[PDB]
């Protein structure tokens, strides 16, 4: 199946002299497995998934040492950015970073990622080729020159093609029981009247894993994309996911509307209708 | 496993 590994960093400045907060979270697909928070007397990376607890003290220390250094360097990066946008020490600012690798059905490197944001918007990103950068403005062009001089792109390409896919392969093996499993959704349709002789059809999808799903409403065999209420995929808490799709439907003395569910856990796509 | 940032990797 299609699998990915991602690290999400946040570097928040404290208003207006305080030590900035560095947080790192590690994901395997949508499953969180590591967390490091700089705000603690003795910060250590913590396991967040059961299948990562088998890893040795050398592994936990390698993570902690990287994240304790990022804490120091991201503090300096927050100072550099403040200077490019002529911002004062008063005011909270944030660097957001996400990087990692994707693998297709075949466990080989598909695509590598390395994106950064300053205060919620795109700042600098590594291109698909993994050898060039996309800078948002003249301030992200200063970062680009520094990174080109430091060969950041080469080293990330070595990491994404190497270490990243190897460790993702390892995590996928040790967590196969929960990570390589596929859980099909439990589907059912609900009907509610919105106003006088006007109804709303809501098709539910529950207990599915992974979160990749598609719910569509077809009127007499045609996709009704804009008229639909496609709610965001939400976690159940039990590591599975849930979603629903709604449509404003007139009574019209007949039923021409059907919902279509497509999920990796289904051997054949489902077609459901309101059964009163 | 995260990546280690070498020297001068700042923004």
């Amino acid at each position: 199946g299609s699998h990915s590994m991602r690290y999400f960093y946040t570097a928040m400045s404290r208003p207006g002299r305080g030590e900035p907060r560095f947080i790192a979270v590690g994901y395997v697909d949508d499953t969180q497995f590591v967390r490091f928070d700089s705000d603690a007397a003795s910060p250590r990376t913590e396991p967040r998934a059961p299948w990562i607890e088998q890893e040795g003290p050398e592994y936990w220390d390698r993570n902690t040492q990287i994240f304790k250094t990022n804490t120091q360097t991201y503090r300096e990066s927050l100072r550099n950015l403040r200077g490019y946008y002529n911002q004062s020490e008063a005011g909270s600012h944030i660097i957001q970073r996400m990087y990692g690798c994707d693998l297709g059905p075949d466990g080989r490197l598909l695509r590598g990622h390395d994106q950064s944001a300053y205060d919620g918007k795109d700042y600098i990103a590594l291109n698909e080729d993994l050898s060039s950068w996309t800078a948002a403005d003249t301030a992200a062009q200063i970062t680009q020159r520094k990174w080109e001089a430091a060969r950041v792109a080469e080293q990330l390409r070595a990491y994404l093609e190497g270490l990243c896919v190897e460790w993702l392969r390892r995590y996928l093996e040790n967590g196969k029981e929960t990570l390589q499993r596929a859980d099909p959704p439990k589907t059912h349709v609900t009907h509610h009247p919105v106003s006088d002789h006007e109804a709303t059809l809501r098709c539910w999808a529950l207990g599915f894993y992974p979160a990749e799903i598609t719910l569509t409403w077809q009127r007499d065999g045609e996709d009704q994309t804009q008229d639909t209420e496609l709610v965001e995929t939400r976690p159940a808490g039990d590591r599975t996911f849930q979603k629903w799709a709604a449509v404003v439907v007139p009574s019209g003395e007949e039923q021409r509307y059907t919902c279509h569910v497509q999920h990796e856990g289904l051997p054949k796509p489902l077609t459901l209708r309101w059964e009163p | 496993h995260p990546v280690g940032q070498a020297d001068y990797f700042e923004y």
Partner: T-cell receptor
Amino acid sequence: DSGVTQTPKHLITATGQRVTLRCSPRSGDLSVYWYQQSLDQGLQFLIQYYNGEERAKGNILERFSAQQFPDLHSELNLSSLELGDSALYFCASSARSGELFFGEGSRLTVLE
Amino acid sequence: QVTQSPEALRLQEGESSSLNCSYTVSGLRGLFWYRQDPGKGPEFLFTLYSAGEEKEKERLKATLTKKESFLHITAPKPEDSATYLCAVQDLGTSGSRLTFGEGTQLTVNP
């Protein structure tokens, strides 16, 4: 060739004494790496400084200390010297490209 | 982590040989070759980054695989006599610190 300047080049002292080694990185380099080369043994990483602050620690001993100054120069302090502290002490500075440029070294000879 | 072989090379002038360097890292950042003359400090020769990458300067040629690096010396002269150090940087480590091998001490018999 190379640009890193170390001093003193040679030091002779007795056991229980304290010595201080100095290192200036290459012009433009902001890091200082301290290395020890004991006899028969190879180069061992002691400590790294970056733009005035401690950044990484090797197998540096508790009676050894170092510092990087705001003008980027560095000082290695070796206390309560032992015969086994006789070695070559090198420091390096890294270029933005990632390469370490070493100094010529400081030969410490500790006598009883 | 880094082991060099042989610890000592005893070569006749003009007699080519290749110095070995075995390494183990989480992931390779860069592999370095230095030359160290007695008294002086390590002098940079080459940096290799990926498997199959070759670099050449005058009589020296360095090559890299997933497990080792070779420093091939073609027709050595007595002025090639020195200790050859091999060092690696790891991607699972912060900064640019080098972990060195114990070195190959070459002597070229003129």
